[PDB]
């Protein structure tokens, strides 16, 4: 019994008005429209949700019928817009996962706007799908999902993998894997610009030199030098302690062998370096200086209960540690070292074997326990490529399984005023009670030095080729570092002076004070070192490497191939010209090292390569050795200094770093480009304040974002 249309053709006037693209002079055009169709003895109507036949041994499609029409080819067509299953979106195989007991509901689909035209013969059966308001009463929810076969509470959009709802103010920020503070700083500067006073209250990083940098630039931030998983265990145990405690002169007591009167409790931790799991308090002993403070397990403190009550009552008032709900935003850039294509020792078959990669899971475990209003997570583009993006999709799947609105974007650092490329992945999450923030469009042009993976090309934050406006010209190396005075290979001065005025627009911006940046970390009045040239120090190469870069010529594109003893051959493979015996330095080791000739089949121009003023550095990285990269200063006999690298990363000059030189390089190399975080910070603040507009995923930053 063949499939046919039921009823009278839709009145011509109303048919053309509702579906105008089907009439008039390769979209399928219609001869007439219908309101109903019968397929396999079942009557279907406009608006019905149906199962639709798909490929062999593939899950049936789910669609909302929007048109019943006979084409101009005498065939019977219907149009539906597709519902996405969780696994139909970009999550794919990561629908299997679990985050704090949350899993993906099999009955939860996502209404898209993707349409298609198919013959009536594809319709399998009807299906009752209900629309659940995410902000409904949970009781009214249950009775509504009780009624349904499937349900949806959000839409899905291929562009930027958006899951989203249908149809001075202060805010607290927690920086997981905070580093020296690049991402958390930018967010609050951009927030402040939008009118939101976002404050980094908590920062967790197990590198002490990074915490020393972030604490110095943000004195009010409670920055904890500890692993993220220990921070998580501490948060759980903190809630229990808070629950327990909340609302003349002492006589001496005898003390046993190792019993001492306490003065106050000055710290709290869970486990740690030399300790095992459990709560420890930093005890200050009466009559003893802070140097004699020690960490003690809580079971050793049963004889000082009021000191614990005082510490918890007191710390809960200042929120030294967040309880669930205290945290408005959670940002974090978990390690990329197990993911990035630089690492020739990754294992694509077990992408979570690396403890670095597991921190992605621990990030979302902390999100799951605190339920912040907004989640911002950054990592590298390989997170969508390594192990077929396993860890990228794991992160997105965790957010939506927790019923967060989510979006995925790829942002190019140079596009916001940097002589970098540095494309990074940014994952937005937002509760159903909040507005999902957008991605800010590029304000500058760049020299393109990398592309997005084909599976995620629709998450690239950029203008369409057909609609690009004139942006600011691309920033080059000279625009960032021509400001700075000359320094040598050995340069140990933490703090020196500028040897001149800023020459360029970027240099005038990067030199702005804290007040001018809207950096309120020191509140009223400037903080320290505004006016000083901080950390303008290169990696102090050894004697061999120094004399090696001393011999690299001051040319554009000069590298190790310019040293005496090496010449080019066929197919640009480096060799020795036997005319010259192998040159040795004063050390007796070769002028050119063997690995430089062995690097990438002897085809690389990177070893001991020199940068030039009209070039860009594609990625500022944590390592500064000139062995396998182009990092030699254009005119001087050294590599780029920490401060030069930080400028390429967008750090304001006042942002002082601490630790050894190698550690300072790691801090700027791991950072989120501060202008990138400042742009996202504006979109976060505009969304937080309910002052955003429309469903569009992309946002043109206001002229005010690029100052005078």
């Amino acid at each position: 019994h063949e499939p046919e249309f039921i009823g009278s053709p839709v009145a011509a006037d109303e048919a053309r008005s509702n579906w105008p693209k089907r009439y008039g002079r390769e979209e399928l055009k219609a001869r007439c429209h219908y309101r109903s169709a019968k397929v396999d003895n079942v009557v279907y109507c406009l608006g019905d949700d149906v199962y639709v036949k798909a490929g062999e041994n593939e899950a049936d499609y789910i669609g909302r019928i929007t048109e019943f029409f006979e084409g101009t080819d005498q065939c019977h067509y219907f149009t539906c817009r597709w519902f996405f299953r969780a696994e139909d979106t970009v999550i794919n195989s990561l629908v299997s996962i679990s985050v704090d007991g949350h899993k993906h509901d099999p009955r939860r689909v996502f209404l898209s706007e993707e349409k298609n035209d198919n013959v009536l013969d594809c319709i399998i059966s009807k299906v009752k799908i209900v629309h659940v308001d995410p902000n409904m009463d949970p009781k009214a929810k249950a009775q509504l999902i009780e009624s349904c076969d499937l349900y949806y509470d959000m839409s899905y959009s291929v562009a930027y993998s958006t899951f989203a709802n249908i149809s001075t103010r202060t805010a607290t920020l927690l920086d997981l894997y905070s580093g020296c503070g690049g991402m958390s700083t930018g967010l609050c500067l951009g927030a402040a610009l939008s009118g939101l006073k976002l404050e980094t209250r908590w920062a967790v990083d197990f590198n002490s030199f990074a915490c020393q940098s972030l604490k110095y630039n943000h004195p009010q931030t409670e920055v904890r030098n500890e692993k993220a998983d220990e921070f998580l265990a501490l948060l759980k145990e903190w809630a229990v302690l808070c629950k327990k405690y909340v609302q003349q002169a002492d006589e001496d007591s005898p003390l046993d062998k190792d019993e001492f009167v306490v003065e106050k409790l000055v710290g709290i931790c869970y486990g740690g370096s030399d300790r095992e799991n459990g709560i420890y308090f930093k005890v200050q002993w009466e009559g003893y200086g802070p140097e004699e403070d020690t960490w003690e397990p809580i079971d050793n403190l049963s004889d000082c209960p009021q000191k614990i009550r005082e510490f918890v009552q007191e710390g809960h008032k200042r929120k030294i540690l967040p309880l669930p709900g205290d945290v408005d935003v959670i940002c974090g850039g978990p390690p990329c070292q197990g993911i990035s294509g630089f690492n020739r020792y990754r294992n694509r078959d077990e992408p979570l074997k690396d403890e670095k990669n597991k921190q992605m899971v621990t990030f979302m475990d902390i999100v799951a326990y605190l339920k912040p209003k907004y989640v911002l997570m950054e990592n590298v583009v390989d997170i969508l490529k390594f192990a077929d993006g396993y860890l990228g999709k794991y992160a997105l799947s965790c957010l939506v399984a927790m019923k967060y609105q989510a979006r995925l974007g790829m942002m190019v650092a140079g596009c916001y005023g940097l002589p970098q490329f540095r494309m990074r992945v940014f994952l937005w999450g937002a509760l159903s009670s909040m507005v999902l923030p957008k991605y800010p469009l590029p304000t500058y042009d760049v020299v393109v030095r990398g592309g997005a993976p084909n599976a995620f090309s629709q998450c690239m934050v950029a203008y369409d080729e057909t609609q690009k406006p004139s942006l600011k010209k691309a920033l080059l190396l000279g625009d960032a570092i021509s400001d700075l005075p000359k320094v040598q290979n050995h340069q140990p001065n933490d703090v020196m002076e500028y040897g001149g005025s800023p020459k360029t627009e970027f240099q005038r911006y990067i030199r702005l004070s804290r007040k001018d940046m809207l950096d309120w970390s020191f509140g009223e009045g400037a903080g320290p070192d505004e006016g000083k040239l901080l950390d303008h120090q290169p990696l102090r190469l050894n004697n061999d490497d120094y004399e090696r870069v001393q011999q690299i010529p001051v040319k554009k594109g000069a590298n190790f191939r310019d040293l005496k003893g090496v010449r080019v051959g066929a197919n640009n493979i480096v060799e020795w010209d036997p005319e010259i015996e192998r040159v040795k330095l004063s050390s007796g080791k070769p002028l050119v090292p063997d690995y430089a000739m062995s690097f990438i089949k002897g085809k690389s121009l990177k070893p001991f390569g020199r940068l030039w003023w009209d070039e860009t550095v594609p990625t500022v990285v944590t390592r500064a050795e000139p062995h396998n990269q182009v990092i030699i200063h254009p005119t001087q006999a050294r590599v780029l200094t920490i401060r030069e690298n930080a400028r390429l990363q967008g750090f304001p000059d006042y942002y002082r770093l601490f630790g050894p030189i190698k550690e300072k390089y790691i801090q700027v190399g791991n950072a989120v480009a501060v202008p990138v975080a400042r742009a996202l910070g504006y979109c976060l603040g505009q969304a937080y304040l309910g002052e955003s507009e429309g469903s569009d995923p992309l946002y043109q930053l206001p002229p005010s974002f690029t100052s005078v």
């Binding site: 002169a249 002492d250 009167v261 050793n300 209960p305 009021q306």
Partner: peptide, 12 residues
């Protein structure tokens, strides 16, 4: 009346 000092044990 006057209370007793609060003590703890010091692990070394």
């Amino acid at each position: 009346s006057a209370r007793t000092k609060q003590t703890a044990r010091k692990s070394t």
